[PDB]
Write a protein that binds this ligand. Structure first.
Ligand SMILES: [Zn+2]
Ligand SMILES: [Zn+2]
Ligand SMILES: [Zn+2]
Lengths: 715, 1146, 88
């Protein structure tokens, strides 16, 4: 019992210094525990327990006064050793572990657990209030840029973990982690509030990103996995979210000034706080919105009559913040939403719509712009075209865009300044997809006729070859009255030099289509005139009307405004406007010389005389140009027209709806009406009411007696 | 529902358009919610019906039908969806017509509405149909629409059809020939969208096909097509160009007007394909064809050139000189006018150049100057152009220009002003122009000595003063912004002038009150107005009519909005403390209290500014202060003295420091919360700098006041109270700093100071805490005042050097060190003295000395420098290896003082000397590397290598210390490493290896312990690599790095956790050299997650692997988050055991 | 000496079925005058709405004479083909 306790202790002591052992000697000690056990299983124990307590206690003297990277170098170098030595002791003490108690009935032995336990009674000595501080100081060092030996920290923590009763973390937390994080909260709390007071936010953002990253390796490399998602939470907590109103106010400037790579960063940073990315979206919507209203504001009046300016301004706005939402805000749907909402808001209600007193001005402009683009290069057009379809998406009064687009496309197919039939087609393809089909088809019918009219002409061209030619080069366009916006008009005495082309064709068309009949549109038909009476002789493009007049100057030379309004039988209200062009052009002069003609009160009395001589330096002058008020008159008119169709469209809906419900309640119906009409426009409620009314008068609906605000369909 | 669908289909053939419409409406409302009631019959009927209605005699219905397809597809068995498509793709060729068009639209709809498993065949089947369609089949119409679909689909769902691509391409290419050109376009579009999905096998057949057919056959189309892919691909065409570039040029010569396209090519080529340097070949051509006008059609040429020059200049920054020195300044300015559109592109190009120059032999900016007068001469002719668009360019130019060179236009204000003024008048509804001009002018006046504008004031005001009173506000705001600067131009208060501004005061001031006194105009205008007026007051005020008091009143008033309010505060902070000691007496009365009022709006900005204002006032308007005003503020303070907002805290502490500076008396009230709140702020871990400095300046000016229950001794007890009764290290440091402050203020000392030793010596039961605050106080105080008196202390301080507590022991080291500065000759010799005498205190004493050297004085130290240095060159007695560091840290600090005559000295112990001498020196130089750029940096950048690229291969721990010094530099100033990488790196990697000779075993029975002396140096090697990662990463041979990273995955546990992370870093950063060696990096990562441990192990033994295993997945994970081209190698062996890993790692 | 010659003339005309003459064939009154109903009835919400309507077939009627017609049947009363409006 003591005959062994001595040599066994000899070995124990050798095993605890680090003197290599002999395979035989390891076993000798094993043997001693074997015999001491297979003879007391608490005597050998306590004696081992003593040897340990009276080993560590002594060791402590070697560090009691060590203090910085030294208790660290000390405590760790001592731990690594004590561990292995005990692993070996635990090895010899097999029989003390196993018979003397319970086995076979996990890396927990008691003899080793006996070693761990006594040492933690070495941990309370230096560590708790020291070896831990030395660590926090060293970590602080590395955080201030000081390259450090991380193994002085690893060793410590790994110890703590194991000195627990991997799963047990009390000691770790209680004697280190808790203080670690606390120190971290303050360290970063202090670094941030000081950097911000001394640096531009764009720079604090760069740093915070960095620190966060640094603190990552600072756990993966020398801390326990346990403290991972907490050091992270805490760091973001102090590095990112107590600085959100600072981040917020700056979010602005980072937009007020197009410095958008930082926006990406702020994004990636707030993208770390729960719901933190919310207020960013709000601020953006508001921003891009005001940003849009401003753009338009600064275009003043021009914008009101410059479609390119207008559409290009909106386009510029959107195109900026889109590619901005793509990179910077990682194409986040939540953000795409802000942009959309903002664009939808300003595109429909802005400075132009305001002064025009109607949101419908935007859609018309968009439509006009399209027209400009399709009149007489590729990348821009197909793209520009494509951008147009983007804007459209946001327009709410879409029927308006549609009416104008057709109204203007039509004035094109006929007369002039249409680009390649390609863009034209390509733009149809684009509408086929956004716009409906009833719409797309309506347009198709227009193209059909033009083609049909084309072939029709090639027929007549022959009919003339096959007989008596005409006194001029004639061509016509027969358009189905129903499919075109055109309206015949201004009464008109047709000059003689044409009458042959007229009858000659009329007869022909009548021979081609028996059941049909033609109604000629002079306000929309032109021709080429030749001048064999001036210094130089030229060909001038001229509206029929203009020709109807000029041709009169083939007899006398002056004609009172009345002498004309009588002859050509072309209307004064309008006949006057034409003359003004003819004057400003310079083929007519009133009487006097000074030309304040641009703004005169040409009364019936006033004379209009042919001017002989001088003329355009060129040989082909196009005297046919828009009467000024002409456009403003067509515009206001097509709107007026849209006002009508709207009510008619509304009722159509009211009906088919009440026709497939037999009874509905006021609201019920209004909701329906909207749902359908939504893709085209937003029927003002008072109007659907004034509509449901007229249907009651037209006897398509009747109120449900014994139930006001409920309607029944009257078959 | 159920009977629904039945009743609907009937109403769907209802002869009455309305019903068929409402029936189809009500049917679609249903097909949207939960795809319920699907009979595998009700479908048959429904679909067949919808497809039928697709041909209804009424458009309204037809439409609904097509709009029905969308929601349908996603609500019926896979064959029925097969049907649809098929049925749709077939009508495509229908001999009716309207069927081909609506069937066409129908198709597109389905396509758009989709995804994942669904869209499989859904495009697949289709793809086949379009193919035969796209074949030149002598029906364009069919093609053209198929090509659209082919394009609409290929891209919204490109991720797949991968196996159809080669089949797609093979039907497209021949179309690039189509006699109808529209088809050629449509096709190119397809190709473009095609390459977005490729695969890596197809980007080449396509290109080659294009390079090949470069056989002089008419129609430069293959041209556009090249450019086309360039924009889409770019990257994917960056390894195909040597043949490209030349082919293009060779053709560019050909004198045609669609030659623009080649430029279009070179442009699109050189705007996406960066690493493709044929820059010059290009610049040259552009510039030559950039003035291609003759006497038509040309111009689009000039455009492309202009557009290209614009491109180049906007990315090749490294080419600034080349830019300013070869045709562009000289030949852009040259063509700085021409047609119109083209003129515009020329300017835009230049701007990009100006912007490129914008940074942050013979510099860019210096080259720029040289450019004007040329720039100016140009603009001068432009500025007076009818085009509104052009003049705008002139202004945005000068602006950006002057924004680059803050002094740029000095020699020319006179040829510009007419230009500026001229445009401040009209060609309208262009408010942009007037605003753009108005901005330019503002920017100008902001960066140019004001003197320059004087002769021009006389003729610049009228047009400005008028813009202010312009109808539109946007113009009014700028006008007001200029006015405000215009004022500082004629009021120079910083640099006295001699310009009489009196003749402009009126008009200026007028237009402004007209705005400031409104409330109908935009707030923007309302603020620029107060701002401006404020300046109008701050700067001429002095000869300002008697319309001033009336105006000051105006402010007071305005200050009660939630808009006006903040801007006026600041404007009032500016009217105060303005040279012309302006009288704000009246407005103080009810305004001051209106200010305090603000101190409760928890609005950062307002608090800060409001406080910042209550200060100026008090400072320059003291007499007129009514005791009833001050405490009207005081009351709102306590909440402002929180550790939550230091700035606000210190801002408000400054205010009290002022109150007591110029109004003692009110002190009485400084006791309530106020006082018992600063005292709290003192006990805060967050208190530092700004506020702390103010907390100190405050006390020092509170005691001097003499006040009942607020005296010296009174306050000490308040600070040092809580401590003498029984928290945070910082607390004591701040406390001692105040104690000292309050001490150097009332030098009635000995009582306190002596009363601070029989506080330490007073060990006989004295809270270990007191001894701390005690020592720290003797320290702070000792630094300023001369304690050369009581010598009883030199020992008391040292007695603590042997305290059982670090906290005190350090505090003692500091105290002595710091006290040493109060009287440097009576203490320094003593210190060095004890350092050699009692070595038992070497460490701490060497730290005390660190404090001395560190922050002493700089004149009082030079003397002893030669002495210190001598003591430190001797203490390389390596006694404690922790001591050699304080020394090295001391040698380092010392060097800084006159480094030119000290670094060389260290760059010489280098050779001869011993392991420790060598170490110490290369360790001292380490403690020289500062975070922020310092004076030593230049010289350091030079001698650095002589320690590094030389200390990497000498011997022992010295190498380790070297690595560390290199790690320390590349982390916070690689600006001293860049050049040295080539030399260093090899070594750095060499230290990454294992020296088997530095490893011994320690056997003891079955147990063996491995000692690896190389582990630490080696750990420092990898730790250097990880650092190169954040910064210097391009100068790194990416593969040598990965070679060695591979080596350290299979190294030691402590070294694995590092590299594992290094992988995850390299995952994100540079992926391509990873995948290439992605198989070599996995064998190891696998090895780990495989390795087992014998249950003969202790509990903790296992956890280790459990943690090391899941730390490797973390990597392996991110090794899969690299373009799924990684699935290719070999890889995820689903395992029962392994499973739990990527599970708990996720 | 003051003579102008016409070299070309590009005219344009609309076509309508000539089975009538700017006449509404339901009520046989006149597409340009109010339908016979509004004509007899007191001025009202309706009266101020009366106009022409065209079908995709190109037959025109007063919006009211045809709208009324469709109340019972669903085809062009002049061309047995389902009526479809097209213009107002
Ligand atoms: Zn009627
Ligand atoms: Zn009909
Ligand atoms: Zn009728």
């Amino acid at each position: 019992l003591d005959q062994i306790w001595d040599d066994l202790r000899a070995g124990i002591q050798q095993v605890y210094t680090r003197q290599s052992m002999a395979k035989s000697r390891y076993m000798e000690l094993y043997t001693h525990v074997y015999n001491y056990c297979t003879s007391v299983g608490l005597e050998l124990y306590k004696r081992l327990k003593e040897f340990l307590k009276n080993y560590l206690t002594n060791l402590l003297k070697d560090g009691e006064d060590l203090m910085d990277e030294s208790v660290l170098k000390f405590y760790t170098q001592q731990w690594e050793d004590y561990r292995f030595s005990s692993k070996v002791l635990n090895g010899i003490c097999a029989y003390l572990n196993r018979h003397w108690v319970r086995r076979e009935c996990k890396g927990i032995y008691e003899i080793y657990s006996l070693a761990l336990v006594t040492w933690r009674d070495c941990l309370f000595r230096p560590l708790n209030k020291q070896v831990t501080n030395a660590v926090l100081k060293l970590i602080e060092k590395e955080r201030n840029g000081e390259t450090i030996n991380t193994r002085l920290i690893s060793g410590v923590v790994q110890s703590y973990v194991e000195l627990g009763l991997g799963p047990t973390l009390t000691v770790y937390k209680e004697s280190f982690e808790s203080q670690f994080l606390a120190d971290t909260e303050r360290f970063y709390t202090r670094e941030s509030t000081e950097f911000l007071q001394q640096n531009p936010v764009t720079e604090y953002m760069k740093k915070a990103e960095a620190r966060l990253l640094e603190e990552q390796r600072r756990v993966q490399v020398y801390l326990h996995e346990s403290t991972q998602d907490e050091l992270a939470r805490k760091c973001e907590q102090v590095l990112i979210e107590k600085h959100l109103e600072i981040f917020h106010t700056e979010f602005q400037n980072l937009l007020d000034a197009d410095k958008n790579e930082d926006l990406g960063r702020m994004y990636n940073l707030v993208s770390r706080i729960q719901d933190g990315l919310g207020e960013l979206k709000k601020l953006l919507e508001t921003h891009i919105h005001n940003q849009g209203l401003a753009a338009i504001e600064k275009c003043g009046e021009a914008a009101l009559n410059d479609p390119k300016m207008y559409v290009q301004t909106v386009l510029d706005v959107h195109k900026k913040y889109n590619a901005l939402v793509m990179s910077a805000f990682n194409n986040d749907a939540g953000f795409v939403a802000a942009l959309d909402k903002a664009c939808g808001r300003f595109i429909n209600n802005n400075a132009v719509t305001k002064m025009a007193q109607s949101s419908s001005k935007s859609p018309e402009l968009l439509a006009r712009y399209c027209d400009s683009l399709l009149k007489k290069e590729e990348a821009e057009l197909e793209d520009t075209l494509n951008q147009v379809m983007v804007v459209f998406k946001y327009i709410e009064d879409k029927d308006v865009f549609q009416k104008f687009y057709a109204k203007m496309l039509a004035k094109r197919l006929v007369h002039q300044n249409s680009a390649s039939d390609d863009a034209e087609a390509s733009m149809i393809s684009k509408l086929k997809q956004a716009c409906g089909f009833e719409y797309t088809s309506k347009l198709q019918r227009m193209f059909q006729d033009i083609g049909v009219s084309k072939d029709l002409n090639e027929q007549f061209k022959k009919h003339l070859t096959n007989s008596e030619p005409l006194d001029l080069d004639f061509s016509i366009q027969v358009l189905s009255s129903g499919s075109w916006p055109f309206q015949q008009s201004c009464t008109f005495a047709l000059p003689s030099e044409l009458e042959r082309s007229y009858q000659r064709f009329t007869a022909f068309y009548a021979s081609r289509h028996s059941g049909r009949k033609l109604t000629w549109l002079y306000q929309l038909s032109k021709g080429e005139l030749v001048t064999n009476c001036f210094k130089n002789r030229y060909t001038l493009q001229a509206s029929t009307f203009q020709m109807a007049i000029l041709l009169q100057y083939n007899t006398e030379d002056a004609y009172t405004v009345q002498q004309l309004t009588d002859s050509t039988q072309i209307k004064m209200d309008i006949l006057a406007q034409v003359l003004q062009i003819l004057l400003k052009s310079k083929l007519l002069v009133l009487e006097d010389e000074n030309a304040n003609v641009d703004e005169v009160e040409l009364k019936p009395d006033t004379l209009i005389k042919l001017y002989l001589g001088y003329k355009n330096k060129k040989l082909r002058v196009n005297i046919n140009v828009p009467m000024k008020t002409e456009q403003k008159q067509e515009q206001e008119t097509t709107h007026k027209n849209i006002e009508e169709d709207r009510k008619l469209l509304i009722q159509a809906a009211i009906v088919r709806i009440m026709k497939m419900r037999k009874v509905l309640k006021h609201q019920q119906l209004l909701g329906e009406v909207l749902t359908q009409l939504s893709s085209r426009f937003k029927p003002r409620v008072p109007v659907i009411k004034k509509c449901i009314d007229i249907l009651i008068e037209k006897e398509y609906l009747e109120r449900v007696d014994g139930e006001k605000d409920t309607y029944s369909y009257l078959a | 529902a159920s009977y629904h669908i039945s009743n609907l289909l009937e109403k769907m053939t209802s002869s009455d358009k309305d019903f068929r419409f409402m029936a189809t409406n009500d049917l679609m409302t249903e097909l949207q919610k939960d795809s319920i009631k699907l009979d595998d019959d009700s479908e048959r009927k429904v679909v067949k019906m919808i497809l039928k209605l697709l041909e209804d005699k009424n458009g309204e219905v037809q439409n609904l039908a097509v709009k029905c397809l969308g929601p349908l597809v996603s609500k019926v068995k896979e064959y029925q969806v097969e049907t649809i498509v098929d049925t749709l793709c077939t009508n495509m060729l229908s001999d009716k017509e309207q069927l081909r068009d609506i069937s066409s639209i129908g198709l597109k709809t389905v396509i758009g509405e989709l995804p994942s498993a669904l869209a499989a065949n859904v495009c697949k089947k289709i793809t086949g149909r379009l193919t035969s369609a796209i074949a030149k089949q002598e029906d364009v119409s069919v093609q053209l629409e198929a090509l659209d679909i082919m394009a609409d689909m290929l891209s919204r769902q490109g991720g797949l059809l991968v196996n159809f691509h080669p089949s797609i391409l093979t039907c497209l290419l021949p179309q690039l020939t189509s006699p109808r050109l529209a088809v050629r376009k449509r096709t190119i579009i397809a190709l473009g969208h095609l390459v977005m999905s490729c695969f890596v096998d197809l980007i080449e057949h396509l290109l080659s096909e294009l390079s090949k057919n470069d056989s002089m056959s008419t129609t430069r189309t293959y041209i556009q097509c090249i450019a086309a892919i360039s924009r889409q691909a770019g990257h994917r065409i960056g390894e195909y160009l040597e043949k490209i570039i030349p082919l293009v040029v060779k053709f560019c010569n050909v004198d045609d007007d669609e030659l623009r396209e080649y430029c279009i090519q070179a442009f699109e080529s050189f705007v996406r394909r960066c690493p493709k340097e044929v820059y010059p070949h290009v610049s040259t051509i552009i510039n030559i064809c950039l003035k291609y006008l003759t006497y038509d059609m040309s111009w689009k040429v000039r455009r492309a050139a202009a557009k290209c020059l614009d491109a180049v200049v906007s990315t090749r920054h490294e080419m600034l000189p080349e830019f300013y020195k070869t045709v562009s300044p000289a030949l852009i300015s040259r063509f700085k006018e021409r047609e119109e559109n083209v003129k515009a592109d020329v300017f835009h190009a230049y701007l990009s150049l100006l912007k490129q120059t914008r940074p942050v032999g013979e510099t860019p900016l210096t080259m720029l100057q040289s450019q004007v007068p040329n720039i100016v001469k140009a603009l001068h002719k432009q500025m007076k152009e009818k085009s509104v668009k052009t003049r705008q360019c002139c202004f945005n130019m000068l602006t950006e220009l002057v924004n680059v060179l803050p002094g740029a236009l000095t020699q020319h204000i006179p040829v510009l002003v007419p230009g500026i003024i001229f445009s401040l008048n009209d060609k309208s509804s262009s408010s942009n122009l007037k605003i753009d001009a108005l901005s330019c002018l503002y920017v100008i006046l902001c960066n140019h000595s004001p003197q320059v504008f004087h002769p021009h004031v006389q003729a610049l005001v009228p047009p400005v003063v008028a813009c202010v009173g312009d109808p539109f506000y946007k113009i009014t705001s700028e006008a007001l912004l200029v006015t405000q600067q215009l004022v500082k131009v004629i009021r120079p208060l910083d640099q006295p002038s001699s310009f009489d501004a009196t003749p402009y005061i009126k008009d200026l001031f007028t237009c402004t009150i007209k705005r400031l006194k409104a409330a109908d105009i935009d707030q923007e205008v309302k603020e620029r107005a107060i701002s401006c007026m404020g300046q109008i007051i701050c700067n001429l005020g002095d000869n300002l009519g008697s319309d001033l008091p009336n105006t000051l009143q105006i402010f007071l008033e305005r200050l009660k909005n939630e808009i006006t309010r903040l801007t006026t505060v600041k404007a009032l902070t500016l009217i105060a403390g303005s040279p012309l000691k302006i009288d704000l007496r009246p407005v103080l009365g009810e305004g001051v209290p209106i200010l305090a009022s603000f101190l409760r709006k928890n609005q950062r900005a307002l608090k800060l500014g409001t406080l910042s204002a209550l200060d100026i006032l008090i400072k320059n308007y003291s007499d007129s202060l009514t005791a009833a005003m001050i405490d009207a503020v005081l009351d709102e303070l306590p909440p402002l003295i929180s550790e939550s907002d230091m700035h606000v805290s210190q801002m408000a502490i400054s205010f009290l420091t002022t109150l007591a500076k110029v109004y003692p008396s009110s002190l009485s009230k400084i006791s309530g919360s106020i006082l018992n709140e600063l005292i709290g702020l003192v006990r805060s871990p967050l208190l530092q700098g700004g506020a702390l400095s103010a907390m100190l300046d405050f006390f020092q000016a509170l005691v001097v006041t003499g006040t009942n229950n607020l005296g010296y001794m009174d306050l000490l007890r308040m600070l040092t109270g809580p401590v003498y009764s029984q928290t945070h290290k910082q607390s004591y440091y701040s406390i001692a700093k105040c104690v000292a402050a309050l001490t150097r203020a009332c030098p009635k000392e000995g009582p306190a100071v002596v009363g601070q030793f029989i506080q330490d010596v007073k060990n006989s039961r004295s809270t270990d805490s007191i001894r701390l605050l005690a020592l720290l106080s003797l320290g702070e105080v000792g630094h300023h005042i001369d304690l050369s008196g009581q010598l009883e202390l030199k020992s008391v301080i040292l007695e603590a050097f042997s305290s059982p507590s670090e906290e005190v022991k350090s505090a003692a080291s500091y105290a002595l060190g710091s006290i040493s500065v109060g009287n440097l000759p009576e203490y320094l010799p003593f210190v060095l003295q004890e350092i050699t005498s009692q070595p038992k205190r070497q460490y701490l004493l060497l730290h005390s000395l660190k404090e001395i050297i560190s922050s002493a004085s700089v004149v009082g130290l030079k003397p002893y420098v030669e002495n210190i240095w001598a003591l430190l060159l001797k203490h390389c007695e390596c006694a404690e290896e922790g001591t050699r560091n304080v020394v090295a840290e001391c040698l380092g600090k010392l060097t800084l003082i006159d480094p030119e005559t000290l670094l060389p000295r260290l760059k010489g112990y280098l050779i001869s000397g011993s392991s420790y001498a060598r170490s110490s020196v290369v360790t001292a130089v380490k403690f020289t590397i500062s975070d922020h750029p310092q004076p030593i940096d230049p010289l350091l950048k030079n001698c650095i290598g002589d320690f590094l690229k030389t200390l990497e291969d000498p011997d022992l721990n010295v190498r380790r210390v070297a690595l560390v010094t290199f790690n320390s530099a590349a982390h916070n100033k690689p600006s001293l490493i860049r050049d040295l990488l080539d030399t260093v790196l090899p070594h750095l990697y060499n230290e990454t290896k294992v020296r088997k000779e530095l490893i011994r075993e320690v056997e003891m029975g079955p147990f063996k312990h491995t000692v690896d002396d190389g582990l630490d140096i080696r750990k420092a090697a990898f730790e250097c690599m990880y650092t190169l990662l954040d910064s210097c990463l391009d100068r790194l041979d990416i593969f040598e790095f990965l070679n060695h990273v591979e080596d350290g995955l299979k190294d030691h546990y402590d070294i694995k956790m590092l590299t594992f992370l290094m992988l995850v870093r390299l995952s994100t950063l540079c992926p391509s050299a990873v995948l290439q060696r992605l198989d070599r990096l996995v064998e190891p990562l696998r090895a780990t997650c495989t390795t087992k441990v014998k249950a003969n192990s202790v509990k903790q033994e296992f956890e280790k692997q459990d943690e090391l295993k899941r730390s490797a997945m973390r990597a392996v994970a991110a090794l899969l988050t690299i373009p799924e081209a990684e699935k290719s190698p070999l890889m995820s062996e689903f395992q029962s055991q392994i499973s739990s890993n990527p599970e708990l790692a996720a | 000496k003051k003579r102008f010659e016409v070299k070309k003339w590009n005219a344009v005309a609309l076509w309508a079925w000539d089975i009538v003459v700017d006449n509404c064939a339901i009520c046989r009154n006149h597409i340009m005058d109010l339908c016979i109903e509004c004509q007899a009835n007191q001025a009202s919400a309706t009266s101020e709405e009366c106009t022409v309507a065209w079908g995709v077939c190109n037959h025109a009627f007063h919006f009211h004479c045809i709208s009324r017609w469709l109340k019972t049947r669903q085809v062009c009363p002049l061309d047995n083909r389902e009526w479809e409006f097209q213009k107002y």
